[PDB]
Amino acid sequence: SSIPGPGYCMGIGPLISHGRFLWMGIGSACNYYNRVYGEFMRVWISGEETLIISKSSSMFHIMKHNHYSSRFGSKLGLQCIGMHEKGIIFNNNPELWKTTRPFFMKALSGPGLVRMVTVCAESLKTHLDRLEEVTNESGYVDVLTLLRRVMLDTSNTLFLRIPLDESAIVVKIQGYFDAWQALLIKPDIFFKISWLYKKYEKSVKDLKDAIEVLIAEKRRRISTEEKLEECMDFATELILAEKRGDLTRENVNQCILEMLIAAPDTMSVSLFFMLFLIAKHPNVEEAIIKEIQTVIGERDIKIDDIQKLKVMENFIYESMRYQPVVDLVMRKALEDDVIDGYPVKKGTNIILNIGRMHRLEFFPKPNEFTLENFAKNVPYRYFQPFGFGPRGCAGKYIAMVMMKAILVTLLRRFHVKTLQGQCVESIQKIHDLSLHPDETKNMLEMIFTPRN
Numbered sequence: 007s008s009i010p011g012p013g014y015c016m017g018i019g020p021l022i023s024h025g026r027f028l029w030m031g032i033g034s035a036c037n038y039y040n041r042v043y044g045e046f047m048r049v050w051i052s053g054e055e056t057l058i059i060s061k062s063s064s065m066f067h068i069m070k071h072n073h074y075s076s077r078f079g080s081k082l083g084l085q086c087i088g089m090h091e092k093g094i095i096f097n098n099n100p101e102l103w104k105t106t107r108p109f110f111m112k113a114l115s116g117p118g119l120v121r122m123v124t125v126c127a128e129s130l131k132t133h134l135d136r137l138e139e140v141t142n143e144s145g146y147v148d149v150l151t152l153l154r155r156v157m158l159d160t161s162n163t164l165f166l167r168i169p170l171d172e173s174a175i176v177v178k179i180q181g182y183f184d185a186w187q188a189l190l191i192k193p194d195i196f197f198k199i200s201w202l203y204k205k206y207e208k209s210v211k212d213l214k215d216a217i218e219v220l221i222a223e224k225r226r227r228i229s230t231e232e233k234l235e236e237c238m239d240f241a242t243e244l245i246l247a248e249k250r251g252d253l254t255r256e257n258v259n260q261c262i263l264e265m266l267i268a269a270p271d272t273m274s275v276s277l278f279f280m281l282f283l284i285a286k287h288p289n290v291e292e293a294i295i296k297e298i299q300t301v302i303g304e305r306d307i308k309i310d311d312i313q314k315l316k317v318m319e320n321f322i323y324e325s326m327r328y329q330p331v332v333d334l335v336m337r338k339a340l341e342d343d344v345i346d347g348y349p350v351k352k353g354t355n356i357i358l359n360i361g362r363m364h365r366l367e368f369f370p371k372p373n374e375f376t377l378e379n380f381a382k383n384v385p386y387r388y389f390q391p392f393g394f395g396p397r398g399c400a401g402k403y404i405a406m407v408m409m410k411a412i413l414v415t416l417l418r419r420f421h422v423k424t425l426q427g428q429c430v431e432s433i434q435k436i437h438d439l440s441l442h443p444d445e446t447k448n449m450l451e452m453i454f455t456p457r458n
């Protein structure tokens with residue numbers, strides 16, 4: 007098998023496709039190219055050949071083997087946002103990534119994943135007793151903002167615990183995201199003409215400078231302190247590693263930033279799409295309340311409860327399957343290989359189109375939202391909402407805990423209504439790095455009406 011895809015127009019092949027990506031958006035460009043050509047095909051972002059793949063078989067191969075534990079993207083765009091060989095998310099240096107990930111992995115599982123289930127519920131309870139902060143005169147709640155705030159609160163009180171300006175940092179975090187999303191695949195030419203990008207350069211500084219203030223304090227409280235053994239957390243772990251010789255201060259700093267943004271960047275959008283799905287699916291929402299009555303009653307949500315919330319678990323999966331937020335994964339080939347039928351040279355960029363994959367394969371009723379798609383145990387090789395393997399989502403387990411926790415704590419207390427005939431299908435969406443709602447539009451509010 008030779009490689010499918012558009013004609014290489016003697017050096018015009020690349021230019022049309024890279025342009026198509028910038029004009030369309032990374033997400034909807036992938037969906038376009040996969041629809042036109044095969045579920046496996048070649049394109050050019052910048053110079054380098056890049057493959058876009060929805061085939062579950064290829065998907066599985068890639069996330070499984072160790073020679074795909076890299077991502078890709080403009081070096082100058084990454085340097086701009088500070089993820090060039092520094093975080094983990096888009097840290098593309100094999101060795102430096104290898105040595106940092108452990109820290110993330112430890113903090114996002116075991117003892118911490120148990121605190122998180124209650125840290126979440128409390129954080130949300132706080133914010134639900136302060137609805138005045140997010141509710142309109144006509145009772146319209148800004149769900150997106152509320153969520154982002156409890157996500158940041160949650161992340162902070164678990165991984166860093168330093169008092170911060172919640173409202174302020176959330177807006178800056180979004181500046182950071184947008185900037186990241188903008189510069190990720192902008193061709194080098196773009197960075198030469200400075201008044202075009204320096205817009206973004208400023209949102210990055212706004213967040214980084216806001217965070218240096220926080221880590222500066224965490225550094226003090228550590229260098230004083232009585233029983234240091236008593237209270238280990240993500241930020242401390244890193245700082246002490248730096249205090250040995252394991253980490254650079256710059257890197258530490260990026261990781262803390264990367265940990266704080268991660269939840270607000272994804273959970274909030276995901277739960278938002280989940281909340282709309284509940285409103286327009288009354289049948290499903292009844293099953294979820296019964297399960298809560300059966301499993302929890304009027305007791306505080308605890309770790310031992312989460313396995314029992316079976317219906318909800320399926321709801322979360324079906325929501326992510328049907329309305330994904332992270333619908334694509336970027337990887338790079340580190341060794342040569344043959345993947346399915348095709349030769350894949352090292353240095354080849356890969357975009358796994360997991361969103362399209364969850365509609366072309368396995369599932370009984372792919373194109374409608376039903377809890378029937380998850381009535382029979384799903385092979386983790388046909389459904390990858392987080393990815394798996396050496397570089398799968400580091401939060402994949404804690405994530406599910408948090409989502410379960412916040413949904414329970416919310417639906418426990420309020421019925422949710424969507425304005426007009428609005429639903430996830432009829433929301434206007436941007437489809438670039440992630441797949442999220444266009445916030446320059448409106449009608450994205452909800453109404454929270456009490457229960458009992």
Ligand code: HEM
Nearest residue numbers: 094095268269272273332335392393397398399400401405
């Ligand atoms: C429901 C929300 C979430 C979704 C849909 C999601 C999904 C994903 C996916 C698909 C990847 C790419 C993995 C791969 O390449 O196969 C990823 C990576 C990652 N995720 Fe998540 N995730 C979520 C929540 C979180 C949370 C809460 C955190 C941390 C608090 C987190 C931290 C990370 C990090 C640090 C990476 C980069 C991993 C690496 O390259 O080493 N994620 N996530």
Ligand SMILES: C=C1C[C@@H]2[C@H](CC[C@]3(C)C(=O)CC[C@@H]23)[C@@]2(C)C=CC(=O)C=C12
Nearest residue numbers: 095267268271272332334335336439440
């Ligand atoms: C929404 C996104 C986009 C995700 C990214 C991890 C790497 C992903 C999956 C890619 O290869 C392309 C889109 C990227 C993620 C989940 C990780 C952390 C975060 O803060 C925000 C994220």
